[PDB]
Nucleic acid binder design. Structure first.
Ligand code: SF4
Ligand SMILES: [Zn+2]
Ligand SMILES: [Zn+2]
Ligand SMILES: [Zn+2]
Lengths: 97, 512, 189, 146, 99, 103, 538
RNA sequence: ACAGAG
DNA sequence: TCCAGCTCCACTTAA
DNA sequence: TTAAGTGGAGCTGGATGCTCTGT
């Protein structure tokens, strides 16, 4: 949340992101903006590229291609504010090797 | 053309298989492609591409033209694959006009694409041994007598032939031989003194080599164009009025092109000798029909002449527009009622009309006519004109004039028919596939009868066939067969709507 | 009666086992994951046979554990069609005869493939075989499981996957036959 | 509108008078040029017949039945030819006169309406694998039964 | 050198940046956020996550800095260990039956 | 309740007779006022129907019906010669076919 | 017995392929159909309706009422979609300049693309080269559409094709029947005289009949786009695997899950626009039966073209005066654009925890790489230290101190459990004896923790460096005054920020790369910044 | 929406 | 409040 | 004489710094 009245927490803004890039700090820029704000996982169907739930793609009606993915929650919110606009963000997931 | 590519995906699967339709649909969908990328973009082996291309270049379904750097590109004909649906109508119209030998001549050409004349007169005479009995074989004379009568009437045409390499470009072999049509010898048949007998399937060098014969699909469509016009006059005026229409179009078979708005004008002095003599009609009563058919505002025929007595022409493009209108207005009545078809005939005649004039001129009140207007703009039978007072184009200061456009509604109605047939094939293939347990069980009880039919077949094998548990299951197999026979027949009858629509869409295009 | 099945896999080795040779820790980890389980199209995996190629041991960001891609071969109980086996009976049912094969248990001798002079029981579970001269209709298939010799004619794979979101059918089935002359109990032939 | 309950019966009454008059010309078969002229009906002829039948108390005016016969044209059942008023019993237009004859439709009905696909109100929402599909349709499984 | 490596002097506006960078979310994270999204929907344009600004959005570590290289663990491992010899299905005893 | 737009620009000048609230969605298959026209019969229309079903069984048997090749057969056995699917193979006229299509 | 299944399918995102849905892949995604207009039931139960918006088969947005599709709470549900049917089609406001783009290239009669046969072979050979970039695509649509707009006749059907341009808000015109002062064309001379019956009753047709052209609308351009051949689709530069031209005109509309539009804003502006779209699908549906004029049906349709436009973008330019909104609502674009959107406000920069903020004050008795954290902030901030062989005796004592004495611990977490026992209660002498390896003790911030440190207007990279923390009893952040040059701190009521990194790798990237001893020189010109200042020079 | 602070 | 693209309109060359 | 390709002029749509601290 926002302020001192609401026990808010401080803001890595747009400019402070630009300083952490300049140091080349990759995992610190990962820890500040994913691990300690809004870490989350989603079920993704690797066949149709859409988001599923509970290991069940309701689009394809199957459970043989669902997979977990580490994503910030504000991007999962983006991936559902874009489908209502009919701008479908289809994913293709490879193995993490 | 998503309905066309869906429907062509089924006709290639039923008639050629699965590893050929992936090549066949991809050529329709994307365009002319060289050979190496079709194996890449689809993923089959390069040998199975060569099998799928040689079966599609056989049946005149894909073409090939040489391009820059000597590469060969394959281009499919989407209109040609849809004419694989009209095969049972082709084999029947050569049974009415020609003998049962000529019924089998067209059948071997439509099932092999390209054959030599020497091969087809053998295969038809072999298959006609089943149709006969008692020492009478089929001989190669009377088959070829039916064959050369087809080439006189252009139902069988010669394929484009190979070029003579001794005359044109001797030396290095091209990747593709670049075939070309020759106008003179399309119907100039090769002579065959060689005769023989059709073998009765007992189971116990070629002078026209390269001369391949194929079915001329453009000839049947000229013939089917006649019966759409002739049987239209037979319903409107008279059967004697229809035979005169039948007489003129039969005379106009060889003397006009297949795309001509006005045919060759024939004088009434020579129609009289051309008519069959069973009609007790004089020359003066013949001139009475030709001046009352000229009095029709539908303009099936016209005067278009003064010399040589009574000069008269019969119309071709305008006769299709009267049929495509009747094609388009027959569906408005059957989908939305007779009172809605009153409006669709009203707004067609008075070319631009509003709501208040329709309810007056058609005697259908408000709130019942306006429902029949609004369900047709959503079905795209009818459009608005929207003449504005201001360039603001605001809805509160303008006039919405209803308008029926024939061409945009005919292309729309054709696009519904392609999907309509694809749904019938999908319902039949669904009920065929889900009864694959019933049909094989009914096949195994018939295979005991089919295998060992005569040699060592005792009489104690006829009671173990109905004895299997398929005996109450025959209710469903009869419910199967009454479903397949209705969906196959409805698949044929929609093609009658396509030909009346597609001929009107083809004839209105200038193709400049 | 087995087949080797060549597979690839990515194995996580946690960092408290860095004292031990990696060839031993992979083999322990793949047996903890593939043993006594029916892989769908290939059958029932018994144990690891050998490791054939062992690629690089990466360390990914966000973890200290070493991930390595492993090429290996695994021994799999998967009898081919028309093979002759020997095993014991679990019991009898009107659905058929349940044949036990050591580790494996789902072998159904169907009543349509039993020896023909007896095909149905007298409302009893235990199946019979009527020979005319001796032992008419009482030659029984005992539930204690004397050794028989049967011939596999059908095998089937049912995909035991979840249908629907989250919050026991037999996956590897086998149909034998006994009707051939010489099959059956080891006493009879 | 005048009345939907009133003009609905004139559609099936005026057509039979244009049918029998076309039927007696068909039974005449004297001269097919004159048989065509034997099928045309005068606008004043058809108007004096319907008011003779005794349908309504209100008088059927000639200016209205001149317009009810246009609905027989718009239903595609009769034609209309305007001739000059060189001679006539009335000749209600100065120098003109109208003539009606009942005709047939051009074609038998199309093959699209014989399939259930041409009549479907949810045709645009049907696909291969979704909810509405040909493999589970009601409109075919009804039509396959009878 | 960044302004002039495509043969033309390009600004550091949103107009010069639309011609240099290829990532769609990098374009949509700066200016005209709506129009780049509908254009990528129209063209069907696929987008890698190779850029820096969309590694920060998608939560994967970026490529510059300490993400440029990969680390290997130096375990006591023997690649290609001695394989177990087969006994039955060797190739010298099983010449096929068909001609 | 009031909306963002003006209702008076949409309509409703009296202030009453607003449309009712749809409680349950419409059915998948709304019933029809009109029916399919029955099929055409006759000795010509039925022979084409008889000829059509004969073409399916014919063209599935001809060698132009290129089936997919089988694979992943498990073992070899002597009964392979008894299970060999024999069918004659058609060869085209290579003078008409391009050179790139030889097997 | 049990079939093998791969346990944890962790996968990495390779690429994102944008696209669009067909209007009947929306039905395959969604769970319910939304037909009702009212938000809540009228009774005192305050229950949501069963086939309207805020149905809980589409998700939940409060802790009290769970979801119905999956039976899970707010914390676990990924949200589920519904859909709305439209009685008449409407333009999608985002693709409206692309619907005009397709209409300028294809023929408006036969739906083929207006090119010669040789020109199709040229561009489709350009599209086969590998590595075609997004810049090379957008230049090609300029080159293709400029070749189509130079032709006035089709090379395939031969029908005339005029200009296609916008003629107001969400209206498309086609000048098919243009005239000149020259000899009149035969096809345009038929259109200007076929108005015969309309002039008979309406007098005002006669001044206006010259201005009559073909007015396109989503009933017609939907029907044209279904007849585009699939060979001619990539010349429109649409990838046909991500979208079709038929999908640009919407006829069905997904509604978002309820966690996109939370129940207490009471309702969101997206939910209130979805009420007005459902309401207009009953206003049009009633007027088609109750016999409204064509002037009313078109106006209602226009309202629906406006209400699906303001649902997506609520900042349009050419809204008429009688249809302009009274107040300002958020569409989807306004919650993506700007500084307070998703991309700048919630994605590129976001609020973090394990952070503090205090007034600063000087201290020269510290080193140049140390910072003095107050004890009130050192008890709140925690670093999760894993238990291993080297720190077990230390962490047992830090558990035994507890949450109130300073070298202490606020939480404790078991080995393979995700639940944190809050260590203020219970006997900590018992939970210190049960520390197994792999447990996480969330100790306080102690002497030697790498901590980031930031003054807020951050102009260069030395505005944020990392120090080593030391705990001191007062209430301010404190550092040596030689470090006042990079931060540009001045001790006049100055607030600086703090960040405790929560990972070992986040520590070591902060110590090696971002320390003060490794950032003495500025990266701009190599001059030293950490050096002496006033009263250290004097 | 306004005022502050650096 | 300032600034690139898009579209409309006269103005020569060329036949 | 006019078809056409290219200049100049007007319209349109986009953008305008970082945080906390309170009412
Ligand atoms: S719903 Fe069934 S019957 Fe109706 S059009 Fe679709 S496939 Fe044909
Ligand atoms: Zn899926
Ligand atoms: Zn849920
Ligand atoms: Zn065109």
């Amino acid at each position: 949340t926002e302020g001192r009245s609401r026990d808010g927490g401080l803001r890595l803004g747009e400019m402070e992101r630009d300083c952490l890039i300049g140091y080349g700090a990759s995992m610190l820029l990962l820890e500040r903006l994913m691990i300690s704000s809004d870490a989350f996982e989603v079920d993704v169907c690797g066949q149709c590229g859409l988001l599923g739930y509970s290991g069940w793609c309701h689009y394809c009606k199957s459970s043989c291609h669902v997979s977990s993915l580490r994503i910030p929650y504000a991007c999962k919110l983006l991936f559902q504010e874009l489908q209502s606009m009919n701008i479908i963000p289809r994913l293709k997931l490879s193995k993490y090797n | 053309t998503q309905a066309e590519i869906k429907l062509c995906s089924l006709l290639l699967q039923e008639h050629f298989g699965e590893i050929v339709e992936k090549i066949g649909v991809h050529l329709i969908r994307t365009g002319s492609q060289p050979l190496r990328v079709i194996a890449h973009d689809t993923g089959t082996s390069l040998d199975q591409v060569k099998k799928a291309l040689c079966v599609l270049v056989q049946h005149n379904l894909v073409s090939y033209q040489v391009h820059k750097r000597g590469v060969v590109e394959y281009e499919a004909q989407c209109s040609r694959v849809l004419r694989m649906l009209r095969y049972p109508r082709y084999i029947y119209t050569t049974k009415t006009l020609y003998s049962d030998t000529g019924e089998l001549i067209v059948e071997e050409l439509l099932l092999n694409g390209k054959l030599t004349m020497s091969a087809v007169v053998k295969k038809v005479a072999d298959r006609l041994t089943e149709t006969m009995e008692d020492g009478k074989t089929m001989d190669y004379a009377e088959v070829s007598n039916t064959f050369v009568r087809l080439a006189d009437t252009h139902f069988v045409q010669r394929c484009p032939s190979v070029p003579t390499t001794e005359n044109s470009d001797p030396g290095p072999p091209p990747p593709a031989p670049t075939l070309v049509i020759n106008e003179k010898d399309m119907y100039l048949v090769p002579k065959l003194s060689l005769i023989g007998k059709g073998k009765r399937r007992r189971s116990s060098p070629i002078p026209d080599d390269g001369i391949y014969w194929q079915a001329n699909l453009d000839r049947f469509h000229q013939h089917f164009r006649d019966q759409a016009i002739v049987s239209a006059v037979a319903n409107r005026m008279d059967q004697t009025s229809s035979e005169i229409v039948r007489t003129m179009l039969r005379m106009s078979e060889i003397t006009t092109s297949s795309s001509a708005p006005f045919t060759q004008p024939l004088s009434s002095n020579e129609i009289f000798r051309s008519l069959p003599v069973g009609y007790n009609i004089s020359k003066q009563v013949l001139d009475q029909y030709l001046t009352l058919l000229a009095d029709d505002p539908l303009e099936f025929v016209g005067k278009s002449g003064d010399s040589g007595g009574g000069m008269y022409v019969i119309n071709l493009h305008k006769a299709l527009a009267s049929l495509a209108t009747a094609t388009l207005e027959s569906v408005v009545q059957e989908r939305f009622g007779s009172r809605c078809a009153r409006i669709f005939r009203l707004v067609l005649q008075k070319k631009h009309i509003e709501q208040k004039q329709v309810e007056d001129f058609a005697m259908i009140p408000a709130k019942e006519a306006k429902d029949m207007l609004y369900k047709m703009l959503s079905e795209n039978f009818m459009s608005l004109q929207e003449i504005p007072k201001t360039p603001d184009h605001a809805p509160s200061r303008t006039f919405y004039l209803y308008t029926v456009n024939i061409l945009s509604a005919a292309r729309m109605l054709l696009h519904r028919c392609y999907k309509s047939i694809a749904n019938l094939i999908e319902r039949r293939q669904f009920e065929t596939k889900e009864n694959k347990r019933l049909l094989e069980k009914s096949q195994r009880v018939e295979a005991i009868i089919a295998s060992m039919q005569a040699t060592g077949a005792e009489e104690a094998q006829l009671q173990e066939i109905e004895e299997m548990i398929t005996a109450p299951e025959r209710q469903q197999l009869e419910t199967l067969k009454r479903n397949v026979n209705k969906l196959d027949a409805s698949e044929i009858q929609v093609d009658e709507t396509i030909f009346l629509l597609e001929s009107y869409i083809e004839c209105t295009m200038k193709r400049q | 009666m087995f087949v080797l099945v060549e597979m690839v896999d990515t194995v996580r080795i946690p960092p408290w086992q860095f004292e031990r040779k990696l060839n031993d820790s992979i083999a322990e980890e793949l047996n903890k994951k593939l043993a006594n389980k029916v892989v769908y199209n290939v059958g029932l995996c018994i144990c690891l046979f050998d490791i054939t190629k062992l690629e690089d041991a990466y360390v990914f960001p966000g973890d200290g554990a070493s991930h390595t891609k492993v090429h290996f071969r695994c021994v799999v109980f998967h009898p081919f069609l028309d093979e002759i086996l020997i095993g014991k009976i679990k019991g009898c049912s009107p659905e058929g005869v349940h044949v036990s094969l050591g580790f494996f248990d789902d072998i159904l001798i169907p009543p349509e493939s039993l020896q023909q002079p007896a095909k149905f029981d007298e409302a009893e579970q235990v199946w019979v075989w009527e020979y005319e001269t001796e032992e008419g209709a009482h030659d029984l298939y005992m539930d204690t499981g004397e050794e028989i010799r049967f011939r596999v004619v059908d095998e089937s794979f049912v995909d035991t996957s979840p249908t629907g979101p989250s919050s026991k059918e037999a996956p590897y089935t086998l149909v034998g036959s006994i009707s051939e002359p010489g099959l059956g109990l080891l006493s009879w032939w | 509108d005048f009345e939907s309950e009133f003009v609905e019966v004139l559609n099936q009454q005026c057509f039979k008078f244009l049918q029998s008059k076309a039927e007696t010309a068909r039974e005449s078969k004297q001269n097919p040029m004159i048989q065509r002229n034997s099928s045309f009906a005068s606008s004043h002829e058809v108007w004096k017949y319907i008011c003779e039948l005794g349908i309504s108390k209100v008088e059927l005016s000639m200016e209205d039945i001149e317009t009810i016969l246009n609905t027989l044209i718009y239903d595609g059942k009769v034609e209309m030819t305007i001739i000059a008023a060189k001679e006539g019993t009335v000749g209600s237009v100065d120098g003109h006169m109208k003539l009606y004859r009942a005709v047939n439709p051009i074609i038998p009905p199309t093959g699209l309406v014989r399939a259930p696909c041409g009549l479907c109100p949810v045709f645009d929402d049907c696909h291969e694998g979704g909810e509405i599909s040909p493999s589970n349709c009601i409109y075919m499984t009804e039509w396959l039964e009878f | 050198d960044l302004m002039t490596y495509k043969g033309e002097v390009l600004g550091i506006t949103r107009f010069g940046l639309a011609k240099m960078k290829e990532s769609v979310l990098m374009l949509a994270s700066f200016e005209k956020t709506a129009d780049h999204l509908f254009d990528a929907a129209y063209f069907g344009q696929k987008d890698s996550v190779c850029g820096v600004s969309e590694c920060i959005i998608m939560g994967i570590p970026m490529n510059i800095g300490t993400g440029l290289f990969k680390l290997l663990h130096k375990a006591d491992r023997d690649p290609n260990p001695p394989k177990r010899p087969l006994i039955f299905d060797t190739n010298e005893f099983h010449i096929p039956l068909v001609t | 309740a009031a909306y963002t737009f003006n209702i008076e620009a949409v309509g409703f000048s009296k202030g009453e007779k607003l449309p009712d609230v749809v409680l349950k969605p419409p059915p998948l298959f709304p019933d029809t006022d009109y029916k399919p026209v029955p099929l055409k019969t006759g000795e010509g229309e039925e022979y084409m129907l008889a000829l059509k079903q004969e073409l399916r069984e014919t063209m599935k048997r001809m060698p132009y019906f290129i089936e997919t090749p089988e694979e992943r057969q498990d073992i070899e056995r002597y009964s392979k010669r008894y299970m060999k699917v024999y069918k004659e193979e058609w060869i085209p006229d290579w003078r008409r076919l391009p050179r790139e299509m030889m097997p | 017995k049990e079939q093998f299944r791969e346990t944890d399918v962790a996968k990495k995102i390779s690429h994102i392929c944008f696209g669009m849905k067909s209007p009947e892949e929306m039905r395959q995604q969604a769970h319910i159909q939304v037909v009702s207009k009212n938000l809540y039931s009228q009774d005192n139960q305050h229950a949501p309706l069963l086939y309207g918006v805020l149905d809980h088969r589409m998700g939940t947005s409060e802790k009290d009422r769970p979801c119905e599709t999956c039976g899970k709470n707010l914390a676990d549900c990924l949200g589920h979609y519904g859909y709305i049917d439209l009685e008449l089609p409407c333009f999608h406001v985002g693709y409206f300049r692309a619907v005009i783009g397709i209409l300028q290239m294809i023929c408006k009669t036969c739906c083929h693309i207006m090119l010669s046969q040789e020109e199709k072979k040229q561009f489709l050979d350009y599209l086969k080269r590998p590595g075609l970039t997004y810049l090379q695509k957008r230049g090609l649509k300029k080159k293709i559409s400029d070749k189509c707009r130079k032709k006035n006749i089709c090379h395939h059907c031969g029908a005339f094709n005029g200009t296609v341009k916008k003629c107001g808000l969400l209206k498309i015109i086609h000048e098919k029947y243009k005239t000149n002062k020259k000899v009149v064309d035969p096809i345009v001379s038929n259109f200007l005289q076929s108005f015969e019956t309309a002039i008979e009753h309406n007098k005002e047709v006669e001044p206006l009949l010259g201005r009559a052209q073909e007015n396109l609308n989503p009933l017609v351009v939907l029907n044209l786009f279904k007849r585009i051949p699939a060979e001619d689709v990539p010349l429109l530069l649409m990838n046909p695997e991500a979208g079709k031209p038929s999908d640009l005109i919407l006829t069905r509309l997904l509604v978002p899950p309820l966690c996109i539009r939370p129940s207490v804003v009471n309702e969101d502006d997206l939910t209130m626009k979805l009420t007005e779209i459902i309401f207009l699908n009953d206003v049009i549906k009633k007027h088609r039966i109750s016999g409204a004029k064509t002037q009313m049906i078109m106006e209602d349709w226009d309202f629906l073209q406006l209400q699906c436009a303001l649902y997506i973008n609520s900042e349009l330019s050419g809204i008429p005066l009688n249809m302009a909104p009274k107040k300002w609502t958020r569409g989807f674009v306004q919650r993506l654009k700007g500084k307070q959107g998703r991309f700048r406000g919630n994605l590129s920069g976001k609020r973090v925890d394990f952070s503090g903020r205090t007034v600063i004050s000087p201290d020269p008795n510290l080193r140049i790489d140390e910072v003095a954290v107050p004890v009130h902030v050192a008890k709140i901030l925690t670093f999760p230290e894993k238990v291993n062989k080297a720190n077990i005796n230390f962490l047992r004592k830090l558990v035994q101190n507890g949450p109130e004495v300073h070298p202490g611990a606020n939480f404790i977490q078991q080995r393979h459990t995700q639940m944190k026992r809050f260590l203020k209660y219970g006997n900590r002498e018992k939970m210190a004896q049960e520390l197994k390896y792999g447990d996480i003790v969330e100790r306080h911030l102690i002497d030697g923790d790498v901590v980031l440190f930031n003054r807020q207007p951050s102009l260069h990279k030395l505005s944020i460096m990392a120090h080593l923390a030391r705990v001191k009893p007062h209430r301010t952040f404190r550092f040596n005054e030689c470090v006042c040059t990079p931060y540009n701190a001045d001790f006049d009521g100055d607030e600086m920020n703090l960040h405790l990194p929560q990972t070992e790798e986040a520590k070591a990237e902060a110590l090696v790369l971002m320390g003060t001893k490794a950032n003495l020189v500025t990266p701009r010109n190599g001059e030293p910044l950490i050096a002496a200042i006033q009263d250290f020079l004097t």
